[PDB]
């Protein structure tokens, strides 16, 4: 939520993207297509598995304790045993509620973050050859075939190759 990409300038997610969490959709003179971006998806996954690693399969061993159920009324000593346990139970219960709320807040935001980074990286690659249409898409001001699109995704796009072409198109009257 906090970076404003996911549930923000990105209108919605793509349910048809099933081979990654982030990716690219393009349209050009040869058609329109889709490809997942592996590195950003993995970055998000890696952070979430880290949380799970702290939380899953990490329980504490306890053995002989105090009794916690009672068949007879006893008063002072029994009140304390019960109170000790209730107090304990309430505090563990607090940490967990807080933990989940906090973890969940950080996860949506970190995932929002990863989407934004990929956008920003993409934005920089295109230099002056594209403009941000404001909804996460770039209008690219030059002929850009599948190989061209592939180069952007693959991080090997050479802005110098297309710059003259793009500038003429951007700055037309």
């Amino acid at each position: 939520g906090i970076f404003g990409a996911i549930a923000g300038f990105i209108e919605n997610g793509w349910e048809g993207m099933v081979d990654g969490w982030y990716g690219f959709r393009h349209q050009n003179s040869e058609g329109r297509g889709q490809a997942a971006d592996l590195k950003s998806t993995q970055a998000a996954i890696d952070q979430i598995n880290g949380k799970l690693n702290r939380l899953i399969g990490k329980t504490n061993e306890k053995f002989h304790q105090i009794e916690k159920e009672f068949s007879e009324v006893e008063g002072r000593i029994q009140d304390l045993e019960k109170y000790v346990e209730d107090t304990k139970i309430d505090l563990w219960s607090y940490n967990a509620e807080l933990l989940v709320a906090l973890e969940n807040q950080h996860t949506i935001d970190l995932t929002d973050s990863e989407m934004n980074k990929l956008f920003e990286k993409t934005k920089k690659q295109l230099r002056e050859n594209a403009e941000d249409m404001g909804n996460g898409c770039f209008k690219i001001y030059h002929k850009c075939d599948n190989a061209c699109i592939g180069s952007i995704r693959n991080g090997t796009y050479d802005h110098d190759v297309y710059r003259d072409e793009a500038l003429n198109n951007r700055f037309q009257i």
Partner: protein
């Protein structure tokens, strides 16, 4: 209780090494036949009616 009006009260005593158990009695003693070993560790007790599984 089970047709018995009398009772026995149970007590316990721990004796350290170098120490000595002394019993002085003039009646009504229900005598120990010996001692239990006492250990320390991870053992406990739980009240439950759940079946034991393999």
């Amino acid at each position: 209780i089970r047709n018995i009006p009398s009772r026995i009260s149970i007590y316990w005593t721990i004796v350290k090494p170098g120490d000595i158990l002394l019993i002085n009695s003039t009646g009504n003693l229900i005598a120990p036949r010996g001692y239990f070993k006492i250990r320390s560790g991870k053992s406990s007790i739980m009240r439950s009616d759940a079946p034991i599984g393999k």
